[PDB]
Design a protein around this ligand. Structure first.
Ligand SMILES: NC(=O)c1ccc[n+]([C@@H]2O[C@H](COP(=O)([O-])OP(=O)(O)OC[C@H]3O[C@@H](n4cnc5c(N)ncnc54)[C@H](OP(=O)(O)O)[C@@H]3O)[C@@H](O)[C@H]2O)c1
Ligand SMILES: NC(=O)c1ccc[n+]([C@@H]2O[C@H](COP(=O)([O-])OP(=O)(O)OC[C@H]3O[C@@H](n4cnc5c(N)ncnc54)[C@H](OP(=O)(O)O)[C@@H]3O)[C@@H](O)[C@H]2O)c1
Ligand SMILES: NC(=O)c1ccc[n+]([C@@H]2O[C@H](COP(=O)([O-])OP(=O)(O)OC[C@H]3O[C@@H](n4cnc5c(N)ncnc54)[C@H](OP(=O)(O)O)[C@@H]3O)[C@@H](O)[C@H]2O)c1
Ligand SMILES: NC(=O)c1ccc[n+]([C@@H]2O[C@H](COP(=O)([O-])OP(=O)(O)OC[C@H]3O[C@@H](n4cnc5c(N)ncnc54)[C@H](OP(=O)(O)O)[C@@H]3O)[C@@H](O)[C@H]2O)c1
Ligand SMILES: NC(=O)c1ccc[n+]([C@@H]2O[C@H](COP(=O)([O-])OP(=O)(O)OC[C@H]3O[C@@H](n4cnc5c(N)ncnc54)[C@H](OP(=O)(O)O)[C@@H]3O)[C@@H](O)[C@H]2O)c1
Ligand SMILES: [N]C1=N[C]=NC2=C1N=[C]N2[C]1O[C]([C]OP([O])(=O)OP([O])([O])=O[C]2O[C]([C][O])[C]([O])[C]([O])[C]2[O])[C]([O])[C]1[O]
Ligand SMILES: [N]C1=N[C]=NC2=C1N=[C]N2[C]1O[C]([C]OP([O])(=O)OP([O])([O])=O[C]2O[C]([C][O])[C]([O])[C]([O])[C]2[O])[C]([O])[C]1[O]
Ligand SMILES: [N]C1=N[C]=NC2=C1N=[C]N2[C]1O[C]([C]OP([O])(=O)OP([O])([O])=O[C]2O[C]([C][O])[C]([O])[C]([O])[C]2[O])[C]([O])[C]1[O]
Ligand SMILES: [N]C1=N[C]=NC2=C1N=[C]N2[C]1O[C]([C]OP([O])(=O)OP([O])([O])=O[C]2O[C]([C][O])[C]([O])[C]([O])[C]2[O])[C]([O])[C]1[O]
Ligand SMILES: Nc1ncnc2c1ncn2[C@@H]1O[C@H](COP(=O)(O)OP(=O)(O)O)[C@@H](O)[C@H]1O
Lengths: 307, 307, 307, 307, 307
């Protein structure tokens, strides 16, 4: 049996699918299905059971057994970078994670969780998995950062696998529910299907991210499960590409449309990463040697799936 | 003693009536009577006691005894296909059901519950009670689907009856409270009694459902109780009929009126089943061999009862 | 010691007064004094103590002793016929009553409670205390009906007094707080003192009720306490009188005014009793043989007290 | 150690000051400081500790010790005569008081509490501390009345001091927070300092009250503590004076202004005491023989303190 | 291990930084991160863990251990002088503090907490740490005052360090979140960077405060920890300077701008301190002999850090 928190969300559901593809269906999904439209992400998948995040937490803290648990993929989190309720953020992200971590540690259950490249918080190089390089620009980022710091305290003493994946800009199938937190690829696709103009922020000529395909993210997750290695690892392609590149791949698929520039949103000024590029040294050194899909490859594959 | 959850609702109250007709009155109804107008559905019936769904759940989970329970007909659920609070849906439908199921299993109490053909989610044939054919279009459907999947895990090991009825489009007496979730028959009748025009969705020429009379649904329920067979079974006539057919039967009774087409509601686009027809192979194979009332028969009988 | 629930309400306060008149002042009143203006109903009376309905219930269910309890007059209920929250109605009326009943039963405390002729729900004769004749038109009525049904299950086995009084149209002193649930007598009086026209519903020419004076209701209550007889008994004059009769008695006292007809309120259409007349066969057979004040007598006595 | 509930309120804070003046500072104040502006009433005083009314109650009911308690002055209450939530009133005034009383009784702690002349409810003479003369005109008054009645049941059996002070119209320093429940003296003063006209109700020519200075009220309280006598005692000057008299004393101090008559407020019609005058027979008979400051004396002393 | 409550706030975060500078990183921060923007204050620091104030309190009161606690710096409080909810203020400031104090006392954990010069409440000299000189002008001040009074009762009997720092007008890095409670220095800086005019209250010519640099405040805190001395001590420079002086230092750095006078805000009239100057006699006598940065020094250092 495997547990996937955030299992009805974007990355989580993709981990579920990947597990299904390996013939594993004995999965417990933990999520918050308040936004019911998220069911789409599970409808075509095969799981054993579903539990709400709040119930799960209660049971975790009471020390309930869930049977023979092989791993927890902890993808569940408040994922909005524009959420400013720190109380909620620190409870739901940081505290929640701590609580899970301890539960796993005590039962020697492999624990594989989601960090974020938001922890790097705006810099132009050296995106390296170490405290010196970390300085989040928002409370979301802070909640992730502090957890990584917590994990770092625990690692030397741990008797079972602990892995944190520092995801960069993930995109692909099963993020339709993320609204304004959905990938630019997604937004452009839906704008184009609506006969609207595809929109980019003002200054996106100079904005670059490490855009990584969700399929690859899933593969990395399973690989680490199979291999047992511990640590905190960047997860991206290693190549930074401009938003313009993403737009290109998208318009190319749709055979139409032309980019329009909207004002840079006030609520992100000072909170924004203008450049990210994953340094994959540690990742490779851990033994994960598979290549990553480029924006051209990933976006077109995604576009096909969206239509 | 028999327990009927959703007992003040449409199908539940009809099960109560059917039990009354067999001389059984030692019934506990579990429901949520917040909408007080639902009392009409019980007023002319004979029951032993009434309990709110929330109290019932608490007692179930505490392992209270209710006396000598012969069966639970679990018809209680949030039945709105346009309810999008997934948290509520999964608690009140899925979790609730699990909780009941376990309670019954442990005491070897026959458990007969409501599934839904919404689990098939829009396809043009092969409405067969098996996972390959299931793909709900909304979270309501998902909550039903996942429970059936759960039941499927339990069945091989079960020591007492477990039956799920996959109801198609049920209509007849005691659904007045269902508002916009009430049968089209019901809506047309009340429109006509109000001197308004009888209304159908745009494109209903091509929309067909397996419309099944509530009386038959009740009979099936009791039959299964008496016969002890387990499984998940489609419950419909086996014949798909157009909404136009329903309208015909109705206008014929009222001796007046002409169909008006209203816009297809935005909130259902992408969430809608355009065709359903129950495959009754498993149902028949279980031994239930009685015929089902056609739309012509059922609707006219209903119309008489409404007036 | 005697307990009167609804003790600050109309009928309850009158039971208190009646007890006072017999030299009994060791009374605990249970009510919900949220509407503070209800204090008037107790101000001139003599009681031992006051408790809120919610606290009372908690203590009842915990099995607290209140000292040496001689009887509970259970007049407390949500008494509005236009309240449509069934959840609340069934908790506060039905469940609450059950809870009291059991408490009394276990301690062999005489339990005398309020039913309602609303249980008959609109019929033109045979207002007899038996299930065949009962069919309430609203959820208030349902909550009363179901409790009577519950009492009926308990009666054959009971070792102490259980009595339910099925009050018809009660009127008299101490109902000023009941707003639109107050007697027509009351409304007419206040309309006339305000220089307004006295108002009756459209079609009141054909509306008749068994109007019974509150003083008589109180007497019946005490009589049953003294005599120990069990059962469910109609409580009204046995004579149906038109609303016109009530108006006559009232205008006669005030020496002025002329009836005006207002529209029949939408919220009561289909929910309304057009005729009631208590069949006093069981009541008389139990041994209560005293006469009841007519509308002419009762209304004029009331009018004097109001001025 | 001494406890003063309502200690941050008008009368309570004055009791604190009086205790300070006798060299006693080991005081626990219990209040509800939601309206923070009430802190002024304590700022210049000396107390040992502060507790919220809700916490206090919890601890009382749990039977916590507070150390060596010498007395409780129970001045805490919802003091608004225009508050019509009876549920709250009866909990916070009546029930709360009962709870304290029992706590004290059990530990033989002298209990000195606040009643009110509102219990007399509008009469033109015989303001005597006995049930025949009591008939409050509002639920505030009722809550006080019923408690006095409760105390009366307890008194013959009590082994420690119980005293209730039936305050008439108290005025003086430390009532600035009472808003529209503040003394007329206070209102006139603030109207005059605002260059507005000093306002009296229409018909105040014929309205008289027993206006008593807060300083005297405090003295009475301490006297009873020192002397140990039990009972319920009127506390006022024994002389009724018109509102006009109060106005006179006030305008005289301010050397300006002329009375304006505003409409008698709707919300008080039928709820209003037109005359009060304390009968001090019992008070004197208990041994308290000190004189009371007249309106002329009291108001001018107050006016000086206000400026 | 060290605990810093209010650790994400202004003074608290500076204590954290100071601890970091001494090589201490084993810190638990307790705060309320509801306003997420406060994360900035911790982002560049090194702590062991984070806990919400409400959870912390629960655990404190349950008597949980946090490991080997060396000290608690209790800087956490509702710090707004214009918050008028006294209930909240007394719970969150006074009660909370008491609760911590007892926890520490019992485990002999050095307890170092924040008082306030607001306790002096407007006077023109003798700002001495003694009750005669204390008279707060608002409920915030009251909550601090009462706690100091409480500490004073405890001190003679205490077996471990208790220190309260009566901070005057603190200013410097990490107060950006304090909005209108932020230093005038801060406000002027942000006004100037916005091309607006730097604003001072009307009458600031005659307003002087003891402005003290946050760096010094931090030093004092650590010094007391190292030295073990107990008591309540003023913490300011000992020199009063006008707001004009602060403005001067600021405009001098920015090389531009001219002071504009805005109306004195209504909500502060009667609640305002016009003059403060710390008397450092006790502070020096305790042994703390280091000098304090003047407004000229402090403000310019701050201005550099802000830019
Ligand atoms: N998407 C990216 O590009 C990316 C990049 C870097 C990091 N990440 C991180 O990776 C994880 C997955 O991201 P995502 O894109 O899949 O986000 P997502 O689509 O929103 O998936 C997360 C789901 O988990 C729920 N959730 C929140 N807190 C939970 C908890 N404590 N336990 C269980 N479920 C919880 C969310 O709902 P509610 O918040 O409404 O309760 C949501 O349904 C998140 O931690 C995210 O921060 C993602
Ligand atoms: N009528 C159809 O065409 C049809 C078709 C397929 C399936 N079904 C299913 O068969 C059952 C009967 O449906 P229906 O048409 O009779 O709907 P319904 O009239 O609304 O009956 C359900 C009643 O039970 C209540 N309820 C909800 N959750 C409950 C719970 N956990 N325990 C007990 N009662 C609960 C509902 O109120 P609240 O949610 O507001 O609390 C309602 O009063 C439902 O499960 C429904 O999904 C019906
Ligand atoms: N007067 C009539 O024409 C007549 C006729 C037939 C039957 N009855 C019945 O006689 C009883 C009293 O009637 P009434 O006219 O005297 O009504 P009433 O004036 O409204 O008095 C009832 C009082 O009891 C309170 N209450 C509600 N639930 C309670 C509970 N569980 N325990 C204790 N008190 C509770 C009510 O407040 P809240 O509900 O707001 O909390 C109200 O203050 C009711 O059951 C009523 O249905 C009266
Ligand atoms: N001064 C008069 O004219 C006068 C005349 C006759 C009788 N009295 C009585 O004398 C007492 C004090 O009167 P006052 O004029 O000083 O009124 P006050 O200034 O309003 O004093 C009462 C204070 O106690 C608080 N409180 C309420 N319930 C409490 C409780 N259960 N325990 C502790 N504190 C509580 C009140 O706030 P909240 O209600 O907002 O919670 C308020 O702060 C009251 O019982 C009053 O009814 C006064
Ligand atoms: N800054 C000055 O010139 C000066 C002057 C006078 C007094 N002080 C005192 O110094 C202390 C801190 O000052 P500051 O300038 O750093 O103010 P601050 O920035 O507001 O720091 C206090 C922080 O702690 C939080 N908090 C509130 N109650 C808490 C509790 N019980 N436990 C833990 N955290 C809590 C506050 O949030 P929430 O209130 O929203 O919950 C806030 O984030 C306060 O006690 C303050 O009164 C400083
Ligand atoms: N440039 C541009 N253009 C257009 N659009 C856009 C851009 N950018 C961005 N965008 C959008 O918005 C949003 C926000 O952004 P940000 O702030 O940057 O965030 P991001 O990163 O991008 O995303 C996020 O992330 C995170 C982590 O990292 C996660 O968790 C989440 O979920 C998300 O993904 C965005 O979203 C877009 O749409
Ligand atoms: N075509 C047409 N026309 C008209 N009308 C209509 C149509 N369709 C539909 N409709 C209406 O609306 C509503 C909704 O529907 P739906 O979404 O589709 O749903 P249904 O299926 O129909 O019904 C339902 O079902 C279910 C299952 O199956 C149940 O549960 C519920 O309750 C219901 O019944 C309807 O209702 C109509 O009215
Ligand atoms: N005819 C006429 N006119 C005028 N007014 C009136 C009439 N009728 C009636 N009314 C009024 O409204 C109300 C209501 O109605 P119902 O629903 O029917 O109610 P009833 O029965 O009469 O009364 C009631 O009752 C009950 C039981 O039986 C109780 O619980 C309640 O509380 C009441 O009493 C009436 O009220 C009148 O005012
Ligand atoms: N005459 C006159 N003029 C003017 N103003 C007035 C008068 N009277 C009165 N006022 C006013 O209003 C108020 C209230 O009144 P009442 O309702 O009457 O009340 P009193 O008695 O006066 O006072 C009260 O008391 C009580 C006890 O008894 C207490 O608790 C409260 O708090 C109060 O004090 C008055 O105040 C004035 O302003
Ligand atoms: N003379 C002044 N000129 C401009 N702003 C002021 C002045 N005095 C106070 N303020 C602003 O108003 C706020 C509140 O002041 P006050 O209530 O005296 O608290 P404090 O003593 O903490 O400054 C301060 O944080 C500051 O931003």
């Amino acid at each position: 049996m495997i547990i996937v928190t955030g299992g009805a969300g974007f990355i989580g559901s993709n981990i579920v699918k990947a597990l299904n593809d390996k013939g594993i269906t004995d999965i417990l999904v933990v999520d918050n299905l308040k936004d019911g439209t998220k069911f789409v992400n599970l409808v075509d998948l095969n799981i054993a059971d579903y539990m709400d995040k709040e119930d799960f937490l209660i049971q975790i803290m009471a020390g309930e057994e869930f049977g023979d648990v092989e791993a927890i993929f902890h993808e569940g989190a408040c994922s909005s970078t524009t959420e400013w309720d720190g109380k909620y953020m620190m409870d739901n992200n940081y505290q929640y994670s701590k609580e899970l971590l301890h539960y796993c540690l005590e039962r020697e259950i492999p624990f594989l969780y989601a960090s974020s490249a938001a922890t790097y918080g705006g810099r132009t190089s050296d995106f390296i998995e170490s405290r010196e390089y970390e300085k989040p620009l928002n409370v979301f980022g802070y909640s992730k950062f502090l957890f990584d710091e917590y994990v770092r305290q625990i690692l030397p003493e741990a008797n079972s696998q602990i892995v944190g994946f520092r995801y960069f800009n993930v995109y692909g199938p099963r993020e339709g529910h993320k609204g304004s937190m959905a990938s630019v690829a997604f937004h452009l696709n839906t704008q184009l299907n609506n006969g609207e103009s595809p929109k980019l922020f003002e200054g996106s000529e100079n904005f670059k991210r490490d855009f990584v395909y969700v399929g690859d993210v899933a593969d990395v997750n399973l690989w680490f499960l199979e291999n047992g290695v511990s640590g905190i690892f960047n997860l991206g392609t290693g190549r930074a590409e401009s938003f313009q590149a993403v737009a290109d791949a998208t318009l190319a698929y749709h055979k139409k449309g032309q980019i329009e520039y909207i004002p840079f949103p006030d609520k992100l000024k000072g909170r924004y990463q203008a450049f990210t590029q994953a340094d994959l040294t540690n990742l490779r050194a851990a033994g994960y040697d598979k290549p990553f899909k480029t924006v051209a490859e990933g976006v077109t594959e995604y576009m096909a799936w969206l239509n």
